Amino acid sequence: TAGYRSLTYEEVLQELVKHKELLRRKDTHIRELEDYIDNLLVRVMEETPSILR
């Protein structure tokens, strides 16, 4: 009864937290790729004397 309610509560909490953590990991991965592209743009800056003359 009280136990059924507590299991229900914990189950909703667990499911929401599961999906939040999935999204958090995806967010981390996208930020990593954005940083990689930013670094390539910095490299292109550094390499501009070779690309343009």
Curated annotation (Swiss-Prot):
Localisation per UniProt entry: Cell projection, Phagocytic cup; Cell membrane; Recycling endosome membrane
Phylogenetic classification of the source organism: Eukaryota, Metazoa, Chordata, Craniata, Vertebrata
Encoding gene, per UniProt annotation: RAB11FIP2
Role noted for this protein: A Rab11 effector binding preferentially phosphatidylinositol 3,4,5-trisphosphate (PtdInsP3) and phosphatidic acid (PA) and acting in the regulation of the transport of vesicles from the endosomal recycling compartment (ERC) to the plasma membrane. Involved in insulin granule exocytosis. Also involved in receptor-mediated endocytosis and membrane trafficking of recycling endosomes, probably originating from clathrin-coated vesicles. Required in a complex with MYO5B and RAB11 for the transport of NPC1L1 to the plasma membrane. Also acts as a regulator of cell polarity.
Naturally occurring in which organism (per UniProt): Homo sapiens (Human)
Protein name: Rab11 family-interacting protein 2
Subunit structure: Homooligomerizes in a Rab11-independent manner. Forms a heterooligomeric complex with RAB11FIP4. Interacts with AP2A1, MYO5B, RAB25 and REPS1. Interacts with RAB11A and RAB11B (activated GTP-bound form). Interacts with NPC1L1. Interacts (via NPF motifs) with EHD1 and EHD3. Interacts with TICAM2; this interaction directs RAB11FIP2 to the phagosome. Interacts with RAB14 and RAB25 (GTP-bound forms).
Domain FIP-RBD per the UniProt entry, residue ranges: 1-53
Region (Necessary for interaction with AP2A1, RAB11A, subcellular location, endocytosis activity and homooligomerization): 21-53
